[PDB]
Design a binder for these strands. Sequence first.
DNA 1: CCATATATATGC
DNA 2: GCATATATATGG
Length: 229
Amino acid sequence: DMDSIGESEVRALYKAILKFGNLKEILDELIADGTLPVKSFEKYGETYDEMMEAAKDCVHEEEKNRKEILEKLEKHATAYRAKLKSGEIKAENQPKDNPLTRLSLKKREKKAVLFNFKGVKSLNAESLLSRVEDLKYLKNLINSNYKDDPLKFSLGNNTPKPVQNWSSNWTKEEDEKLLIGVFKYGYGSWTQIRDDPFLGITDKIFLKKVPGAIHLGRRVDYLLSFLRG
DNA sequence: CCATATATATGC
DNA sequence: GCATATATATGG
C-alpha cells in the first residue's frame, strides 16, 4: 500500500538511474531532496534490480532477434549475388528494394531497444545498461587517481577525436572538465556543469549554437566508451 | 512555455 | 561506425 511502486516511482527511478547510474547507495539523498517519492530503501533497491534485469533481458532478446534476421538476410543476399554473377539477374537496372539493400539497411539500422516496465512504457534498455557501466567506470577513474582533488583529473595521453564545428573552442581540456562535471553533478546536469566556475566551461556551452544538451550527452557517451576501449 | 528522446535522411 | 538537424512525441 504505502510502499507500493507505481508509475510515478518507476519513472522517477528510471530518470534517476540515467543521471546517477547505480544509485542504490544514494537513495537516502535522492528521497530527501525530492528526486524520488518517499518509499523504503529496500523497495527502491528491489525495483532497481528488477529494472536492470529487465533491461538485460530486453537487450539479450533484441540481440537474438537481430542475429536471426541477419542470418536469413545474408542467405538471400548470397543467393542474389550468384545470380547477378551468373547473369540470371541484370546488374544494370536493379530495383531500389532488393536482397542486398535489405541486408545493408538492417545492418546499419540503429533503433532504440525499448521495454515497458510496471505500466511505464518506452524505457531504453541500452541507455540504462550503458549509463550504469559508464558512470561506474568514470567514478572509479576519478576515485582511484584523483580522489582528493577531482579537478586534477586528466585524460593523459589518450587523444579523443576532435568535436566538429562546435560554436565554442572545445579541446581535450574541456572534455576533462565535462567529465568532472558529470562525476560531480550527474549525467544530464548541464546547467550545473556550465555554471560551476571551477570547470571553466561556462562560456562554452549553449543551453542554434553547439554544444547544447544533446551534443554534450553524445560527447560524454563517446568519451567514456573511448576511455573504456 | 520548458525539457529529453527517437526515427529519419544525410554527411562524415 | 557516429554526428547532426529536422520533425515529432511526450513528460513537466
